[PDB]
Design a protein around this ligand. Structure first.
Ligand SMILES: [Mg+2]
Ligand SMILES: [Mg+2]
Ligand SMILES: [Mg+2]
Ligand SMILES: [Mg+2]
Ligand SMILES: [Mg+2]
Lengths: 244, 241, 196, 204, 226, 231, 195, 243, 250
C-alpha cells in the first residue's frame, strides 16, 4: 500500500539525531545571514537579502524582517513561505493572549509557543519540519529587551548577540570579539553592519541587499518603538557607519 | 524510482503516471472524430466487435451524458464508464443547483479539474481516457470540448482521437484550410454525418459497413445516437456520389 | 387549492386552479400548480408551497439522473421517489401531491400521495382544500375510458364547483393533457367556467 | 430579563464640517441598582471610534474582539483600518452570530484618512448597517435621543458648535431615562486631533 | 416597506421606498432597499433587513464566482434557485422576502421569493407592509406591452401608494431599470416628495453652554520615533 | 517473494502469499477431526501441551446450544471468529426467534475472513475451524479456511498429520454416516479416525477432547475422565 | 450562597463573606469559607448556585496556580480578573452556564496598589473602590458612599465594614451567620479571626 | 520495474499489472458459463469433487440477487461472494427508491463501477473473479460477463475459468447454428453438455454439475435452480454427447 | 480506500534541497514565456498563446485570468495547475476577504493567500507541489499599482518588471535595459511586445499573443450606472485588434 513511499520524517538515526531536522538545518545554512544584537537601550536586527536583482521592487519587499506585534519582531532564515505560516500563527497567539489577559504577551511565552509547534512536526504527524530559523527581538516589562533564536527542532535559547543562516560560525566569532555588556544601540547598529560586511558572500554590502530594524525605548518616554528601516534609511546608516 | 509509480515530479519536471495514462488511452485501438455543422455537432467513432459471442448492441464508447450533451471516450471501458457516470451526476447536480442545463464547455472544465486532482493527489490514479464532449450550446452554438489525463482541456473547430489521430487531424486541417471557415457549411445533420464518415474513410484508407461505425449527433435541445440502419442510409448516400 | 388528475382513453389530464393565499389575501391569482418533473410525468401540488416546490425540484433532479442512466422512468417510479421524500420527512413537511404520467406500455396513470406519505394508485384523484366540496360530484360523474373532450369537461365542471365554494381556490383553471401525441396546455378563464 | 436593557446606557454620534462627534453616558447598572459611574462605552482602534450600548459583558467582549481583529488587520495590511472598512467588519462579525447574537447597539464614527470625509454608522444587534448622513443613536434612551437629535441637529456645524449640540442631545435624553446617566463623555474628532471632554451632569 | 417589480417591452423595473423602522420609530429616513446581486440582476428586500442584505451578498458572491467559473453572464434563474434553496434550508428563520428582477442572455425575468423558500413568476409583483396599497395601483393600471416610460411611471406610482397609505413605508422612491442589451440604470432617490420643511427656530447653542469637568487630547497616532 | 509483503498483493501467477502463509499456521497446529451421521455430529481434538507442567490447550469452543467448533492454528484468532459466531447465532435467536442454520454460519465466517484478504493494513486469520451443528435440516459439518473457503462435509480433519485421519474417514464413509441414534459408536469412529494421525504420542485422559451435538443433544464438550471411556 | 462584600482602602483590599450554608429548610453549616486564594497576593470570594460556585472557584485556582508554576511569576490582579471574566463570558453561552458571581481582591506588587474587581456570572467586570453581589449592595452602598475615603487605613476599612454588616444583620430577613473577613496587602493574605 | 508491485500503478505500457495478475486467479478457477436463450438466461458451473467426503448438492456456487438475477463466477470464491453481497445492497437500494426491480444493464454497471473502484487505489486489491450474471427485466433477457478490471459487455454466450477456450468454441457453434434463437429448455441441455465438454481441462478429478435459469415462460422471470428430473435429463443428454 | 498518504511527499535531502520544489521549478522553466511590466499609471502582463493544434480554438484557453476587478494573473508551467489555482484564488478573495470587509483584497494580500495554498502543497500529506510560477498584477487604493511573482515553494516577490518560463533569463536582461520609473502604460505595453517577440518562434500577432492590463477604471465594463463610487474594473484584456494596432507602431 502507501507505506512503500513513506520517508518517515520523524525518526531517530542510530546516533540519536533527527534526520529531517539536521537536513533542514543544512538548508538554513544557505539562507541569507540574519543578525540580532541586544543593547541596554534597545535591540538591533540586521539581515541580508539573497542575491537580488536591480528590477526587484525593494521598498515593498519583505523576506527577512517581520512584525509579530508592536513589541516583538523576528528575523527569518530559511524557506520564506514556511516562515509566513509560522509568523501568522505567532501573530494570532499574541492576540489571543492580549484578549485573554488584557496584557501584551511576554516575549518568551510567544517564543515557547512557536517552538512547541516546530517540535510537534519532529515527533508526530509524518510531515516534514519547517525549514526556518527565527531570531526573536522583543520587549516586555518583566525581562526588558530580549533576544531569542529557534530552529526546526523546536529548541530555543536566549542571547545577547546571535546570528542565523549562512556563515554563522564566522559571524558568531566576530560578534563574540567586539560585543560588550554596556553597549548602546548606535554601537550595536555598527557592529551588526560590520559583521555582515565581513561575512557576506557578495562582493560589497549595499542598501539594496539589506533589511534593517531597531526596537528602541527611543519612543517618547515610557514606551517602545519598532522601526523597520526604509531603503533610503539603510543607505544613510551605511554611509554613517562608513561602509559605503 | 518511485517517482514513476505515483504522481510526483521526476527530476525533469515530468509526471510519468500521467504520460502512461495517455498510452492506456489507445489500448482499445479505436479512432474517433468530431465536427461541427451550422446547427449541429457530429461525433463518429469506430466500432469493433471482435467476439461473435458478444451482444453488439451493448458495445459502445458514446454516452448520452444529459439531454443536450454527448460524450465519446477514447480508452478502456471501465474508466470510460467511471467518467460517464460522474459526468452524468455532475450535469444533473448543476441543473438542480443553478436552474439551467450545464454547458458542454463547463462540464469539460469540471471533468478536467477532477482529472487535474488525480495528477496532484498521490492516492488517486489518473483515468486512462480522453473525453470528447459535444453539444449545441444555447449561448456558444455547436461545441466540441476535449479532456485528457493531464487535466488539460480546450474547445475545437473539429478534432480526432485515437492511434491514427494524426492522419485524421491533418485531413481535417487541410479541408478547413480550403473552406476558410470554422465549421461544415451544411443545413442538415445527415449531410454533416456524411462529411464526417467520408473524411474518416479518406484519412484511414478503410471502407466501413453499418456495423463498423458508431455515430452521435447533437442538435438544439437534444443529443442522440444513430442506429445501424440510420448509419446504413448514410453509407448508401456516400456511395451514390 | 383545488387540484385533480383524471385518466382517460388516450392518457391522463391534470387540472388545477391558480389561487395562492396568505390568510385571506390572494398573494398570487395566476399561480401555476401543474409541475413538470419529467417530459410526460407531471404533478399537482397542495399544502406548503415551499415544501412542494422543494420536493418537486428534488424529484425532477432524481428523474433527470435516472433518465441519463436507465432511460425514461415509469410513472410508478416517479410516484415512488415522491413518496420516499414525503414519508421519510413526514415530520417536517406539509405536502399533498398528485402524480400523473403517460407511458406507452402503461398509458395514463394517477398516483395520490396525501400528508402521511402513503401512495394510492387511482383512476382519478382529487386534492387540496377545495376538493372536499366535489367528492359527491366527481364520484357521480366520473367514468373510465372517457374521451379527451369529456375529461376536459369533467375537470372543468369539477374545479368550477370547487372554486365556487372554496375561498382558497380561484382564478383560472389550468390543465395539462398527457397522451402519445405529446403535451398540451389548456387554460380556462372565469367568464367561461363560472357560467357552467 | 430583556438583555438589551439590564445594564442600560446610551451612545450618540453626529457629523459636522470636516469633523465627527461621538458621545456616551458612563452608567453601568444591574437593573435598578447603579453599579459603576466609570463604564465608558466608546473605544477606538487607530482613528476609528466605536461606541457600544447594550449588555455590558458583550460590550466588553466585542471591544476585545475588534481590538483583536484590527490589530491583525494592521499587521497584514500595513495600515490602520478605515471607518468604511471597519463598519463592514462589525456587520460581518455580528451576523456570524445570527442565531445566538450579541445583545448590543454598536455605533461607528471617524474620518477617512485619505479622503477626509466624515463618517458615521449604526447597527442593530445582528449586523444591519444604518449609514446616516446626520446622526446615529443607540441605547435605552434611543427614542429620547432621536427626539433631541431631530430638532437640535443642523448640517455643517463647526467642531466647537457640534460639541454643544451633541452634548445637549445626550444630557437631556439621559435625564429622561432611568438607566442612563451617572456622567458622560464627548469625543470631538478632527482629521489629526481628537479632544475628549467629560461632562458635568446630575447624578441620579 | 413597499417594493414592486414590473415587466415591460424590453426589460424589467424594480422600485422601493426608503424608510426603515424599528417598531414605530424611523431608524433611517433614506434607506437603500434595492440591492445588486450582479450588474444586471437586482433585487429588493422586505422583512428582516440584515437577512435581506446578508442573503443578497452571499448569493451575489457565489453568483460572481459562478460567472467567472462558467465564463458566462449570470442568470436570474440561478440567483433564484440559490436563494430559494438557502432560504428553504433555514425554514423561514432567515426573514428575507425578495423581489428578484434582471436581464441575462436568456431574456428579462421577474420573480418573488418568500422567506420559507417558495418562489413565484409574474409580470407585476409587490412585497412588504405596503404591498396591498401597491398591488391596488398595479391591478388598476397594469397592461400588457408597457413601454419603459410607462413601467417606471407605474412602478413609482405603486411605491407612492405605499408611502402615503402604509405607515411602515415612507420618504423617497428608489428605482432600477434593467433593459435587454443595455446597462442597468440605478436611479437612487428617483422621487423626493417628502423633504422636511424649514424649522421655526435655530437650536444652535451659545458656545460654553455645556458644563465640562475635564478636557484631554486623545492619542490616535501610533507610538512615535525618537 | 516480492509479492508476500502484504495481503493486498497478487503474485504474477495470481497467488496471495500472505493467505498461503496463514494457511501454513494451520498445518503447524494440532490435529482435530470432524465427522457426522444423520442424527449426530462429532468433533474430536488432540490437545497440545507446552510441557509436562503445563495444561493442554483447549481446542473446542461452544457457539450456541446447537452449534460449536474446533480450532487448529492461532488460538486468539479462533476466539475472535467464535465470538463473532456466538453473536450471529445470538442475533438470529433474539431478533427472529430462529436458530442460525449451520450453512448460513459458514457463509458469515467466509465473508468475515474475506475482508481481511482484500484490504491494506490487515492480515488474514491464522486459524482453521471445524464447525458442527444440528439445525432444521439435520446434522452438519463444515470446514473453514482463513482464505474464506468454507466447505460442507461428511467428515474431515485439519492440523498436522491430518491426512491420515482424512483417508480413514474416506474409507469409512459408508459406515459412519449410518451410525444413527448411537452417539458412543460415532465418537468411537472419530477417536479411531484421529488415531491415524498420531505418532510417538497416544491418546491420554488430559490429551483428548471430544464434542457432540445431535437430535436431542445440546452441544457439549467432554474433557478429563469423561473421555477415559473412549481411550 | 448569600452576602459577599469588598472594600479597597489605601494599602489593602478587604473581603467579607457570610458563613451560612442553607439547603432549603435547614442551615447545614455556619462556618463556611466562601473564598479561594488564586495566588499569594490575589483572593477571590464567590456566591451563586450550589456546587457551581466551588467548582468554578477551584477551577480558576488550578489555572492560576498552573500559570504561576509555568512562568515562575505571579499574574497581576488585572490579568487574573480578565482571565476570570473571559471564562464567565464563555460560560454564559454554554449548554449549562456557571451561575457564579465573584469579587477579586488583589495587591499589585508592581504598582504597589490594592485592586478590587467585581464580576457577575454574565462576565460583567468593573474595577471598584467597594463592591458587592446580590442584595448586599442595596443595604450597604449608602453607608459606603457616605463614609468611604480612598486614603482610609485598614483599621478604618474594617470599622466601616462592621457598620455595613450591622446594617445587614438589622434589615436583612435571612440569618447569614456573620462573616469571615480577609485582608489582602503587600505581605499577602490573612484572616481576621475576631469579627 | 516495480510497476507490478502496487495496484493502480500504470506501467510504461499503460497497463495495470495487478489487475492482470487477478485474471490469472480467474483462469485458475473452475469453468462457469452463461447462455442467453429466447426469453431468458441459463447459468451453469463445474464443481470439482476434491474428495468423497464432500456432501453432494450442498456446496452451492450459483447465487441469486434480488429475485430475478443469477450470478456465477470463477476464481477466488470469497471474492465472488463479496461482489454478490454488494450487488444485493445495490439492488435493494435501487428497488427501495425506484420501486421497480433493478434492470439488468443497470445492475451490470453497479457491479462494474464497484469492481473498477478496486483498480483506483493501492490500498485495495482487485477482484480475483470473473462474474457471469444476468436475468429478465422489462426489456427482456440479458447476459453479462464482468472482469477484474471492471470491464463488462453484453453476451449471447459467456464462459470463464480453466476450460473457457473449449466452452467458448461450443458457444460459438450454438450462435452460428441458431440465429433464430435457443429455447430455455434447450439452453439447459446445451449448458450441461458444454460444462461436461469443458471438464477435459479438469479431467483429473470428477465433478458435480450445477445449473440455474431465469425464463419468462418457464420460471415467470424469476431465478430458479434446475433440480431433480430436469437436472438428470440434462446430465443424461450431456453424458450421451461425450460418448 | 481513504487517502492513506498522510505523510509528506516533499522532504529535505541531505544537501538541504527540497527535491519536489526544485523539480516543480524545472517544469516552470520548460513552460512558455510570460512577463509583467509595471508603469507609473498601470501594469501590463503578457504571454504567448502556444496553440497545441491549429484545429484548437485558442481563444477558449485563457492564460491571462481576472482574479478580481482590479487584479489579473498569468503563468508559466503546467496549465491545469494554473486553472485550479485561479479557481481557488477567485474563491479565497471572497471567503477570506470580501465577505468580511465588503471590498476586494489588496494585491499583496491576495498574492499572500495564493502563496499559502502553494506552500501547503509543499508540506501537506500525499500531494505534490504546484508546477507553476504566477505573475499577479493589480491595483488597490492604498498601495497603488503592483506586480508580484509567486513560485511553487510559496515564496513571492514584488517586481518593477520580470519574466518567467522558457526565455526568462534573456527577457529579464532585455527588461533591465528598457525599464525606468517614468514609463507610461503605453510605453510598458510597447516594451512588453518587444520583449515577448524574442521568445516567440512562429506567428506573432493578436491571435497568438495574450495581453492584459491593470490601468484606469473602465465604467463601460461595469454593467450598470447610478452609483458614483463604483467606477468599473481596472483589469482589461486587450483584444486581438488592439494588439495588432500596436504591432504596427513596433
Ligand atoms: Mg495520482
Ligand atoms: Mg417546512
Ligand atoms: Mg373562490
Ligand atoms: Mg437618568
Ligand atoms: Mg437614580
Amino acid at each position: 500500500g502507501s507505506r512503500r513511499y513513506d520517508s518517515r520524517t520523524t525518526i531517530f538515526s542510530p546516533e540519536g539525531r533527527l534526520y529531517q531536522v539536521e537536513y533542514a538545518l543544512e538548508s538554513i545554512s544557505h539562507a541569507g545571514t540574519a543578525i540580532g544584537i541586544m543593547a541596554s537601550d534597545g535591540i538591533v536586527l540586521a539581515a541580508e537579502r539573497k542575491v537580488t536583482s536591480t528590477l526587484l521592487e525593494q521598498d515593498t519587499s519583505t523576506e527577512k524582517l517581520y512584525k509579530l506585534n508592536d513589541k516583538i519582531a523576528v528575523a527569518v532564515a530559511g524557506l520564506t513561505a514556511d516562515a509566513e505560516i509560522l509568523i501568522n500563527t505567532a501573530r494570532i497567539h499574541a492576540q489571543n493572549y492580549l484578549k485573554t489577559y488584557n496584557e501584551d504577551i511576554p516575549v518568551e511565552i510567544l517564543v515557547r509557543r512557536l517552538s512547541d509547534i516546530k517540535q510537534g512536526y519532529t515527533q508526530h504527524g509524518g510531515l516534514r519540519p519547517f525549514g526556518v530559523s527565527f531570531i526573536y527581538a522583543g520587549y516586555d516589562d518583566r525581562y526588558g529587551y530580549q533576544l531569542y533564536t529557534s530552529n526546526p527542532s523546536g529548541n530555543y535559547t536566549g542571547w545577547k548577540a546571535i546570528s542565523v543562516g549562512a556563515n554563522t560560525s564566522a559571524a558568531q566569532t566576530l560578534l563574540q570579539m567586539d560585543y560588550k555588556d554596556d553597549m548602546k544601540v548606535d554601537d550595536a547598529i555598527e557592529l551588526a553592519l560590520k559583521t555582515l560586511s565581513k561575512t557576506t558572500d557578495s562582493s560589497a554590502l549595499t542598501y539594496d541587499r539589506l533589511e534593517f530594524a531597531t526596537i528602541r525605548k527611543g519612543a517618547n518616554d515610557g514606551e517602545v518603538y519598532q522601526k523597520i528601516f526604509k531603503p533610503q534609511e539603510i543607505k544613510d546608516i551605511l554611509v554613517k557607519t562608513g561602509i559605503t | 524510482g518511485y517517482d514513476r509509480h505515483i504522481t510526483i515530479f521526476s527530476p525533469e519536471g515530468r509526471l510519468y503516471q500521467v504520460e502512461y495514462a495517455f498510452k492506456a488511452t489507445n489500448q482499445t485501438n479505436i479512432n474517433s472524430l468530431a465536427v461541427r455543422g451550422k446547427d449541429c455537432t457530429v461525433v463518429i467513432s469506430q466500432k469493433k466487435v471482435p467476439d461473435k459471442l458478444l451482444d453488439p448492441t451493448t458495445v459502445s464508447y458514446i454516452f448520452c451524458i444529459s439531454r443536450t450533451i454527448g460524450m465519446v471516450v477514447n480508452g478502456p471501458i471501465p474508466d470510460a464508464r467511471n467518467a460517464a457516470l460522474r459526468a452524468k451526476a455532475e450535469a444533473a447536480e448543476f441543473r438542480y443547483k443553478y436552474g439551467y442545463d450545464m454547458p458542454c464547455d463547463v462540464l469539460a472544465k469540471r471533468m478536467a479539474n477532477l482529472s487535474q486532482i488525480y495528477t496532484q493527489r498521490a492516492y488517486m490514479r489518473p483515468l486512462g481516457v480522453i473525453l470528447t464532449f459535444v453539444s449545441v450550446d444555447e449561448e456558444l452554438g455547436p461545441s466540441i470540448y476535449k479532456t485528457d489525463p493531464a487535466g488539460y482541456y480546450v474547445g475545437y473547430k473539429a478534432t480526432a482521437t485515437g492511434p491514427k489521430q494524426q492522419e485524421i487531424t491533418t485531413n481535417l486541417e487541410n479541408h478547413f484550410k480550403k473552406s476558410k471557415i470554422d465549421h461544415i457549411n451544411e443545413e442538415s445533420w445527415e449531410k454533416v454525418v456524411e462529411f464526417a464518415i467520408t473524411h474518416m474513410i479518406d484519412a484511414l484508407g478503410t471502407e466501413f459497413s453499418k456495423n463498423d461505425l458508431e455515430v452521435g449527433v447533437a442538435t438544439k435541445d437534444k443529443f442522440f445516437t444513430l442506429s445501424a440502419e440510420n448509419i446504413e442510409e448514410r453509407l448508401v448516400a456516400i456511395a451514390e456520389q | 387549492t383545488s387540484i385533480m388528475a383524471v385518466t382517460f382513453k388516450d392518457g391522463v389530464i391534470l387540472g388545477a386552479d391558480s389561487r395562492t393565499t396568505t390568510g385571506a389575501y390572494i398573494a398570487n391569482r395566476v399561480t401555476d400548480k401543474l409541475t413538470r418533473v419529467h417530459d410526460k410525468i407531471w404533478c399537482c401540488r397542495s399544502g406548503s408551497a415551499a415544501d412542494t416546490q422543494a420536493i418537486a425540484d428534488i424529484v425532477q433532479y432524481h428523474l433527470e439522473l435516472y433518465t441519463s442512466q436507465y432511460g425514461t422512468p415509469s410513472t410508478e417510479t416517479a410516484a415512488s421517489v415522491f413518496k420516499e421524500l414525503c414519508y421519510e420527512n413526514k415530520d417536517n413537511l406539509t405536502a399533498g401531491i398528485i402524480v400523473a404520467g403517460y407511458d406507452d406500455k402503461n398509458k395514463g396513470e394517477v398516483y395520490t400521495i396525501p400528508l402521511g406519505g402513503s401512495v394510492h394508485k387511482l383512476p382519478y384523484a382529487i386534492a387540496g382544500s377545495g376538493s372536499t366540496f366535489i367528492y359527491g360530484y366527481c364520484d357521480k360523474n366520473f367514468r373510465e375510458n372517457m374521451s379527451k373532450e369529456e375529461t376536459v369537461d369533467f375537470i372543468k365542471h369539477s374545479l368550477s364547483q370547487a372554486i365556487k365554494w372554496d375561498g382558497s381556490s380561484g382564478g383560472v383553471i389550468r390543465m395539462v393533457v398527457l397522451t402519445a401525441a405529446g403535451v398540451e396546455r389548456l387554460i380556462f378563464y372565469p367568464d367561461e367556467y363560472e357560467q357552467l | 430579563s430583556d438583555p438589551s436593557s439590564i445594564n442600560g446606557g446610551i451612545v450618540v454620534a453626529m457629523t459636522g464640517k470636516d469633523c465627527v462627534a461621538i458621545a456616551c453616558d458612563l452608567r453601568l447598572g444591574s437593573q435598578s441598582l447603579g453599579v459603576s459611574n466609570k463604564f465608558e462605552k466608546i473605544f477606538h482602534y487607530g482613528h476609528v471610534f466605536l461606541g457600544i450600548t447594550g449588555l455590558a459583558t458583550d460590550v466588553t467582549t466585542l471591544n476585545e474582539m475588534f481590538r483583536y481583529k484590527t490589530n491583525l488587520y494592521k499587521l497584514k495590511e500595513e495600515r490602520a483600518i478605515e471607518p468604511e472598512t471597519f463598519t463592514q467588519l462589525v456587520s460581518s462579525s455580528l451576523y456570524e452570530r445570527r442565531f445566538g447574537p450579541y445583545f448590543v447597539g454598536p455605533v461607528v464614527a471617524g474620518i477617512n484618512s485619505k479622503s477626509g470625509k466624515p463618517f458615521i454608522a449604526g447597527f442593530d444587534l445582528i449586523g444591519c448597517i444604518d449609514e446616516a448622513k446626520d446622526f446615529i443613536v443607540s441605547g435605552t434612551a434611543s427614542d429620547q435621543l432621536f427626539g433631541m437629535c431631530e430638532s437640535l441637529y443642523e448640517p455643517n456645524l463647526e467642531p466647537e458648535d457640534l460639541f454643544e449640540t451633541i452634548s445637549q442631545a445626550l444630557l437631556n435624553a439621559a435625564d429622561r431615562d432611568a438607566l442612563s446617566g451617572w456622567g458622560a463623555v464627548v469625543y470631538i474628532i478632527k482629521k489629526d486631533e481628537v479632544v475628549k471632554r467629560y461632562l458635568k451632569m446630575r447624578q441620579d | 416597506t413597499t417594493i414592486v417589480g414590473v415587466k415591460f417591452n424590453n426589460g424589467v423595473v424594480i422600485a422601493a421606498d426608503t424608510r426603515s423602522t424599528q417598531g414605530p420609530i424611523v431608524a433611517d429616513k433614506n434607506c437603500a432597499k434595492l440591492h445588486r446581486i450582479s450588474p444586471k440582476i437586482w433585487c429588493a428586500g422586505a422583512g428582516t433587513a440584515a437577512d435581506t442584505e446578508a442573503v443578497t451578498q452571499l448569493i451575489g458572491s457565489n453568483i460572481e464566482l459562478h460567472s467567472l467559473y462558467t465564463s458566462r453572464e449570470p442568470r436570474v434563474v440561478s440567483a433564484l434557485q440559490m436563494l430559494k434553496q438557502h432560504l428553504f434550508k433555514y425554514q423561514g428563520h432567515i426573514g428575507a422576502y425578495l423581489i428578484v428582477a434582471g436581464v441575462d442572455p436568456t431574456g428579462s425575468h421577474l420573480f418573488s421569493i418568500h422567506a420559507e423558500g417558495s418562489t413565484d413568476v409574474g409580470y407585476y409583483l409587490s412585497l412588504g407592509s405596503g404591498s396591498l396599497a401597491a398591488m391596488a395601483v398595479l391591478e388598476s393600471h397594469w397592461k400588457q406591452d408597457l413601454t419603459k416610460e410607462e413601467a417606471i411611471k407605474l412602478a413609482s406610482d405603486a411605491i407612492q401608494a405605499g408611502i402615503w397609505n402604509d405607515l411602515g413605508s415612507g420618504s423617497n422612491v428608489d428605482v432600477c431599470v434593467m433593459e435587454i442589451g443595455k446597462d442597468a440604470e440605478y436611479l437612487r432617490n428617483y422621487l423626493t416628495p417628502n423633504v422636511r420643511e424649514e424649522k421655526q427656530k435655530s437650536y444652535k447653542f451659545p458656545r460654553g453652554t455645556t458644563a465640562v469637568l475635564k478636557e484631554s487630547i486623545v492619542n490616535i497616532c501610533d507610538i512615535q520615533e525618537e | 517473494n516480492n509479492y508476500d509483503g502484504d495481503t493486498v498483493t497478487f503474485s504474477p501467477t495470481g497467488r496471495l502469499f500472505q493467505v498461503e502463509y496463514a494457511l501454513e499456521a494451520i498445518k503447524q497446529g494440532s490435529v482435530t477431526v470432524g465427522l457426522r451421521s444423520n442424527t449426530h455430529a462429532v468433533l474430536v481434538a488432540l490437545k497440545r501441551n507446552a510441557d509436562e507442567l503445563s495444561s493442554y490447550q483447549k481446542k473446542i469452543i461452544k457457539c450456541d446450544e446447537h452449534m460449536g467448533l474446533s480450532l487448529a492454528g492461532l488460538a486468539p484468532d479462533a476466539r475472535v471468529l467464535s465470538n463473532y459466531l456466538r453473536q450471529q447465532c445470538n442475533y438470529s435467536s433474539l431478533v427472529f426467534n430462529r436458530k442460525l442454520a449451520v450453512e448460513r454460519a459458514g457463509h458469515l465466517l467466509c465473508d468475515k475472513a474475506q475482508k481481511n484478504t482484500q484490504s491494506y493494513g490487515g492480515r488474514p486469520y491464522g486459524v482453521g475451524l471445524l464447525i458442527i451443528g444440528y439445525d432444521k435440516s439435520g446434522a452438519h459439518l463444515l470446514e473453514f479456511q482463513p482464505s474464506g473457503n468454507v466447505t460442507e462435509l461428511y467428515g474431515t480433519a485439519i492440523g498436522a498429520r491430518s491426512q491420515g485421519a482424512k483417508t480413514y474417514l474416506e474409507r469409512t464413509l459408508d459406515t459412519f454416516i449410518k451410525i444413527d441414534g448411537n452417539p458412543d459408536e460415532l465418537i468411537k469412529a472419530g477417536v479411531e479416525a484421529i488415531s491415524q494421525s498420531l505418532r510417538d504420542e497416544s491418546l491420554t485422559v488430559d490429551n483428548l477432547s471430544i464434542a457432540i451435538v445431535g437430535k436431542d443433544t445440546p452441544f457439549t464438550i467432554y474433557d478429563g475422565e469423561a473421555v477415559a471411556k473412549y481411550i | 450562597m448569600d452576602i459577599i462584600l469588598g472594600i479597597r482602602v489605601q494599602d489593602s483590599v478587604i473581603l467579607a463573606s457570610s458563613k451560612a450554608v442553607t439547603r432549603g429548610i435547614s442551615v447545614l453549616k455556619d462556618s463556611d469559607d466562601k473564598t479561594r486564594q488564586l495566588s499569594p497576593h490575589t483572593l477571590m470570594s464567590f456566591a451563586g448556585e450550589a456546587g457551581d460556585t466551588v467548582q468554578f472557584a477551584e477551577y480558576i485556582q488550578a489555572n492560576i496556580q498552573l500559570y504561576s508554576i509555568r512562568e515562575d511569576y505571579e499574574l497581576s490582579p488585572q490579568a487574573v480578573s480578565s482571565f476570570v471574566r473571559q471564562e464567565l463570558a464563555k460560560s454564559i453561552r454554554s449548554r449549562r452556564p456557571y451561575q457564579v458571581n465573584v469579587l477579586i481582591g488583589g495587591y499589585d506588587k508592581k504598582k504597589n496598589k490594592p485592586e478590587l474587581y467585581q464580576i457577575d456570572y454574565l462576565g460583567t467586570k468593573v474595577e471598584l473602590p467597594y463592591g458587592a453581589h446580590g442584595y448586599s449592595g442595596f443595604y450597604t452602598f449608602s453607608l459606603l458612599d457616605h463614609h468611604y475615603r480612598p486614603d482610609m487605613t485598614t483599621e478604618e476599612g474594617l470599622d466601616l465594614l462592621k457598620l455595613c454588616v450591622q446594617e445587614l444583620e438589622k434589615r436583612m430577613p435571612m440569618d447569614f451567620k456573620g462573616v469571615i473577613v480577609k485582608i489582602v496587602d503587600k505581605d499577602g493574605i490573612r484572616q481576621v479571626d475576631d469579627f | 520495474t516495480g510497476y507490478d508491485l502496487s495496484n493502480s500503478v500504470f506501467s510504461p505500457d499503460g497497463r495495470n499489472f495487478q489487475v492482470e495478475y487477478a485474471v490469472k486467479a480467474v483462469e485458475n478457477g473452475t469453468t462457469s458459463i452463461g447462455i442467453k436463450c429466447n426469453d431468458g438466461v441459463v447459468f451453469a458451473v463445474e464443481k470439482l469433487i476434491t474428495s468423497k467426503l464432500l456432501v453432494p448438492q450442498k456446496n452451492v456456487k450459483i447465487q441469486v440477487v434480488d429475485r430475478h438475477i443469477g450470478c456465477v463466477y470463477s476464481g477466488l470464491i470469497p471474492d465472488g461472494r463479496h461482489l454478490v453481497n454488494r450487488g444485493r445492497e445495490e439492488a435493494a437500494s435501487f428497488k427501495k427508491l425506484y420501486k421497480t426491480p433493478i434492470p439488468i444493464p443497470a445492475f451490470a454497471d453497479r457491479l462494474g463501477q464497484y469492481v473498477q473502484a478496486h483498480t483506483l487505489y493501492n490500498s485495495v486489491r482487485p477482484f480475483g473473479v470473473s462474474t457471469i450474471f444476468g436475468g429478465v427485466d422489462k426489456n427482456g433477457a440479458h447476459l453479462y460477463m464482468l472482469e477484474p478490471s471492471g470491464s463488462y459487455w453484453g453476451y449471447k454466450g459467456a464462459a470463464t475459468g480453466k476450460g473457457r477456450q473449449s466452452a467458448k468454441a461450443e458457444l460459438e457453434k450454438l450462435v452460428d447454428h441458431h440465429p433464430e434463437g435457443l429455447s430455455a429448455r434447450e439452453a439447459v441441455k446445451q449448458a450441461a453438455k458444454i460444462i461436461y465438454l469443458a471438464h477435459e481441462d479438469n479431467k483429473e478429478k470428477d465433478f458435480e454439475l450445477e445449473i440455474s435459469w431465469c425464463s419468462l415462460s418457464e420460471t415467470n422471470g424469476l431465478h430458479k435452480f434446475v433440480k431433480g428430473d430436469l437436472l438428470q435429463e440434462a446430465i443424461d443428454f450431456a453424458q450421451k454427447e461425450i460418448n | 480506500m481513504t487517502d492513506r498518504y498522510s505523510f509528506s511527499l516533499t522532504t529535505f535531502s541531505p544537501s538541504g534541497k527540497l527535491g519536489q520544489i526544485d523539480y516543480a521549478l524545472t517544469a516552470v522553466k520548460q513552460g512558455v514565456t510570460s512577463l509583467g511590466i509595471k508603469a507609473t499609471n498601470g501594469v501590463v502582463i503578457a504571454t504567448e498563446k502556444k496553440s497545441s493544434s491549429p484545429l484548437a480554438m485558442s481563444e477558449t484557453l485563457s492564460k491571462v485570468s481576472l482574479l478580481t476587478p482590479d487584479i489579473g494573473a498569468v503563468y508559466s508551467g503546467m496549465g491545469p495547475d494554473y486553472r485550479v489555482l485561479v479557481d481557488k484564488s477567485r474563491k479565497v478573495a471572497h471567503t477570506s476577504y470580501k465577505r468580511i470587509y465588503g471590498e476586494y483584497p489588496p494585491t499583496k494580500l491576495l498574492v499572500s493567500e495564493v502563496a499559502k495554498i502553494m506552500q501547503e502543497a509543499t508540506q501537506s500529506g500525499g500531494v505534490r507541489p504546484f508546477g507553476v510560477s504566477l505573475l499577479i498584477a493589480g491595483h488597490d487604493e492604498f498601495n497603488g499599482f503592483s506586480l508580484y511573482q509567486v513560485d511553487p515553494s510559496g515564496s513571492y516577490f514584488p517586481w518593477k518588471a520580470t519574466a518567467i518560463g522558457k526565455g526568462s533569463v534573456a527577457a529579464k536582461t532585455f527588461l533591465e535595459k528598457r525599464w525606468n520609473d517614468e514609463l507610461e502604460l503605453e510605453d510598458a505595453i510597447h516594451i512588453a511586445l518587444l520583449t515577448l517577440k524574442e521568445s516567440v518562434e512562429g506567428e506573432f500577432n493578436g491571435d497568438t499573443i495574450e495581453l492584459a492590463i491593470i490601468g484606469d477604471e473602465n465604467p463601460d465594463l461595469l454593467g450598470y450606472t447610478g452609483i458614483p463610487t463604483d467606477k468599473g474594473p481596472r483589469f482589461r484584456k486587450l483584444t486581438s485588434q488592439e494588439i495588432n494596432d500596436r504591432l504596427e507602431a513596433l
